[PDB]
Design a protein around this ligand. Structure first.
Ligand SMILES: Nc1ncnc2c1ncn2[C@@H]1O[C@H](COP(=O)(O)OP(=O)(O)NP(=O)(O)O)[C@@H](O)[C@H]1O
Ligand SMILES: Nc1ncnc2c1ncn2[C@@H]1O[C@H](COP(=O)(O)OP(=O)(O)NP(=O)(O)O)[C@@H](O)[C@H]1O
Ligand SMILES: Nc1ncnc2c1ncn2[C@@H]1O[C@H](COP(=O)(O)OP(=O)(O)NP(=O)(O)O)[C@@H](O)[C@H]1O
Ligand SMILES: [Ca+2]
Ligand SMILES: [Ca+2]
Ligand SMILES: [Ca+2]
Lengths: 305, 305, 305
C-alpha cells in the first residue's frame, strides 16, 4: 500500500525518498496526482517522471470493474451513529465513510453539540461491525470544551481517560493554516494505518469568509476552496475515513460558499429549532435518501430523543 | 513571546522594526496574520516574506495535541464573577476568559449597570485563583458615570483611588474610530503583560447602525462587522483577556446584527424585566451551559440578589 | 477648537472653506465625521481626504484616559434646575448637560408647562456655579405662548425684556424641516461660543407620525429617527448643551417611537396626574438615579411644590 513496493519494479531508492517528501505516502496517491504536479519538484524530469506511472500501473488494474464486483468492494464503507436512533434512520445508518457530510443552522441549532457527540460515539463498537478508532478535530472558532466530553462519556459508560486520549486537536488560526494542517492529517493517518475513523472541521468558512472581504477578489476564494474541497475528498478515499464539516448561514437564509460547496458536499443536513431543546433535521442533497425530517433534543449527553 | 526571539533564528534587525510598525508584536501575532497581510507593507517581498513564517515554525509546534494535553493547557482560562452568586451559577463560574460574551435587553434591563460592576469586581481576588487586574472600557453612547463606581466600591470595601485608577476609558465617536481604537488596545496590552483582564465595549452597534440606512447598502456592514468580530477574538487569545459586549434590540424582538453577531458570540445572555428592581436572565447559545433562568437585583451597588 | 488651527499643520486655505460649507466648524466635528461623509463633497478625493484626519490627530490624543482623569474632565457638565426642589432631588441636581432627557405623559400632565419654565430658569445663576445663557426652542404643535413666560418671569423677579430676548424660536412644519433646522442650530451655537445652554424640541414625533402610515412603510422612519437622534447627541457634545425633548403616548400606555428612542434617551421621566394641580413624576431608564417619585404642582408660575 505504501511507497515501498515500487522498489522491486525498477524505481530506485533515490526517487522514493523524494516522493515521500512531497506528500505521497501511499500507492493510491501516485494515481491521484497528475504529471504536471509531479514535475514541479526539482530532482525529477519528465523522462523519469513518466516511468513511475508504468510501475504504478502494474500494481492495480487501470480497468473497468463490473458493478456487481463494485458492490463487493463497497463493503469496507462503515457507518458512524449520531447518538439518536431517529436521526440515524434519517441518514440511513449514520455518517458515511467515503464522503463529505455538511450541517448548517442558524446560531443555536446544535452544530458544535453534534460534533461533540461524534468524538465519543465513534470510539464505540456499533452496527455493521464497525470497530471504532481515533478522531482528528480541527476547530476554527474556539468551541472545543473538553469537559463537555466528560458529560457524554457518562451516558455511554466509558472511562474518562480512554475518551480524552483518542482525540487529537489543533486550532487553525487562518485559512492558510487550515490548508497546511492537512499535511499533518495525512502524516498521522499513514503511520497509524486503520485506527483513525473520522475528521471534523468545526467550520470550514469561519476563516475563509473573513479574510476575503472584498467583492472584487471573491473569485479566487473559489479556486482556494476548490483546493481543500478536493484535498479533503482525496484524503477520505486513500485512508477510508469519514469527513464531517459544519457551516454557518447568512441572510431568507442559505449557507455560505454557494455552488462549489453545495456541489462538493455529498450530504447536507439542515438544522432548525423547535420548542425548547427540540430541533428539526431535514435532508438536502443526498444521493440515496429522500427529503424527510426527524427530531433530536440536546440534553446533558448531547444528542438524544 | 514578543519579537526578539526571531533574531536568533536567521532574521536581521532590519525587518523586525517594520513588523512592529503594522501592529504585530507577538510570535502568535505572526501565526494570526496571513501571508496576504504581510505583503502590503512596503519593503517586504516574496522570497523574504516567507522565511519569517518558517522561523516562526521552530518556536511552536504546528502539530496536533492530544485532547488530554489540551485540558492541561486550558487551566489558564479564568472566570470573572458578576456580583451575584445566582447569576455566576447560571454562567458556570462567571465570564469566560477566551471568548466573546453578549448581553441584550429592552431598554432598562441593566446592561450598563452590569458593565459598571465588572469595573470593580474584576480588581478583586476571587475564585479559581484569579488575581485581578486592570480594565479597558470603550463607551459608545455616553454612559460611563464614574461616580457610579464609588457606589460599588463601597460594598466591596476598597478605597476609591485604587478603583478609579485601574480603569482606562476612551469614547469611540464613530465606527471607524471604533476600529482604529483597537490598535491602542493591543499596544496597551503588550507593554503591560498580564495585568489587563477584560475589555468592555458598551455597545458594538450604537454606531454601526446609524451611519448606514436600510437595504440600500447592507453588504458594507457585514464585511465590516466581520473585521472587528475576528479582530476582537484574536486579541482575546494572544493576551488572554475576557471580552464583554452589550447589544440593543429592535421590533416580537430580536437583537441587531443578525447571524454574523449570533455566530461570532460564544455566549449570549438575554435580559428582561420583572417587578420593580428584579430582572430575569436567560441563556442563549452557550457551548456548555443549558437554558436556565436566574434573578438579580439592581441595587445601590449594582448587581445583587 | 474651530478650524483655523489645521492651517498651521499642512492644510492650505483652499480646502478649509469647503469644510465650513457642509457644516463642519470644529476640530471635534472632523472627529465626529467619518471618512465616508467627507468624500461626497465634490472636490475632495482619496489621497487628500486622509491628511485632514491625521493632521486632526496632532491636536488631540487618540488615546486612553485613566478614569481618574476623566472625572476631572467631567466637571464642565452643568445641571439646570426645573423650578421645584423636590423634582431636582429626583433627577439628581436637575437636567444633565451632555445627554438627552425625555418626558412623556397622557395629555394634560404638564409637558409644555415644564418646557416654559426652563426658558426662564436657565437664564438664572443657580447651583454648581452654573452661569446661565440663552435658549433655542423648536416647537412642533403650536404651543409657545410667549405671554406665559411673563407669568414665570415674575416669580423669579427678572424684567420682561431680558427674559424674552434670550429665547430663539422656530417652528418646524414637517419632519424634513425638523431635520434641516439643526444646521442653523449649529451655526448659531458656533458663532456665539458658550452663551447657549439648552435646546428644546417641543415634541419629536408630532410630525414623524403624520407623514408615515401603518406597517406598510414602517422602516423609512427608524432609519430617519436614527439620523436625528445621533445628530442631536453629537451637537450636545461639541458645544456642551442640554437637550430636552418631550414625547406623546398611545394606547395600557407606552410612548411612541419604541426601542430606538428608548435606547437613545439617557433619562426618561414619566408624568401622570394627581388630584387637581398635583402631578406625579417617575424615573424610567436613568444611568445613576433609582426609580422614585415626586409630586409637583402646575401653578401660575409653572412648576412648583
Ligand atoms: N450542557 C448542555 N446541556 C444542555 N443544553 C446545552 C448544553 N450545552 C449547550 N447546550 C445548548 O446547545 C445550544 C448550543 O449548541 P451549539 O452546538 O453550540 O450551537 P452552535 O451552532 O455551535 N452555535 P454557533 O457556533 O454560534 O453557530 C444552546 O441551545 C445551548 O443552550
Ligand atoms: N444607583 C442606582 N440605584 C438603583 N437603580 C439604579 C441606579 N442607577 C440606575 N438604576 C436603574 O437601572 C436602570 C438603568 O439601567 P441601564 O443599565 O442603564 O440600562 P440600559 O440598558 O443601559 N439603558 P439603555 O442604554 O438606554 O438601553 C433603570 O431602571 C434605573 O432606575
Ligand atoms: N396659567 C396657568 N395656571 C395654571 N394652570 C395652567 C395654566 N396654564 C395652563 N395650565 C394647566 O397646565 C396644563 C397644561 O398642559 P400642557 O403643558 O399643555 O401639557 P401637554 O401634555 O403638552 N398637553 P398636550 O400638548 O395636548 O399633550 C393643563 O392642565 C392646564 O389647565
Ligand atoms: Ca459552534
Ligand atoms: Ca446603556
Ligand atoms: Ca403640548
Amino acid at each position: 500500500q505504501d511507497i515501498d513496493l515500487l522498489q522491486k519494479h525498477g524505481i530506485n531508492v533515490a526517487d522514493i525518498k523524494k516522493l515521500k517528501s512531497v506528500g505521497i505516502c501511499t500507492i493510491k496517491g501516485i494515481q491521484m496526482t497528475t504529471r504536471r504536479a509531479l514535475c514541479n519538484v526539482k530532482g525529477l524530469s519528465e523522462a523519469k517522471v513518466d516511468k513511475i506511472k508504468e510501475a504504478a500501473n502494474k500494481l492495480i488494474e487501470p480497468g473497468f470493474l463490473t458493478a456487481f464486483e463494485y458492490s463487493e468492494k463497497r463493503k469496507m464503507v462503515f457507518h458512524i451513529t449520531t447518538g439518536s436512533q431517529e436521526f440515524d434512520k434519517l441518514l440511513g445508518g449514520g455518517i458515511e465513510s467515503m464522503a463529505i457530510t455538511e450541517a448548517f443552522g442558524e446560531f443555536r441549532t446544535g452544530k458544535t453539540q453534534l460534533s461533540h457527540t461524534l468524538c465519543v460515539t465513534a470510539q464505540l463498537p456499533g452496527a455493521g461491525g464497525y470497530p471504532g478508532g481515533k478522531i482528528i478535530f480541527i476547530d476554527t472558532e474556539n468551541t472545543f470544551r473538553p469537559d463537555r466530553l466528560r458529560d457524554i462519556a457518562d451516558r455511554f459508560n466509558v472511562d474518562h481517560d480512554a475518551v480524552l486520549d483518542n482525540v487529537l486537536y489543533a486550532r487553525a488560526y487562518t485559512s492558510e493554516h487550515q490548508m497546511e494542517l492537512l499535511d499533518y492529517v495525512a502524516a498521522k493517518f499513514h503511520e497509524e494505518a486503520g485506527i483513525f475513523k473520522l475528521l471534523i472541521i468545526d467550520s470550514i468558512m469561519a476563516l475563509f469568509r473573513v479574510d476575503f472581504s472584498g467583492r472584487g477578489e471573491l473569485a479566487e476564494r473559489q479556486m482556494k476552496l476548490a483546493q481543500m474541497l478536493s484535498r479533503l475528498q482525496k484524503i477520505s478515499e486513500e485512508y477510508n475515513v469519514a469527513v464531517f464539516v459544519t457551516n454557518q448561514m447568512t441572510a431568507p437564509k442559505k449557507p455560505i460558499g454557494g455552488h462549489i460547496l453545495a456541489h462538493a458536499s455529498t450530504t447536507r443536513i439542515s438544522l432548525r429549532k423547535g420548542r425548547g431543546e427540540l430541533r428539526i433535521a431535514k435532508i438536502y442533497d443526498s444521493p440515496e435518501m429522500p427529503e424527510n425530517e426527524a427530531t433530536f433534543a440536546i440534553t446533558a449527553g448531547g444528542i438524544g430523543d
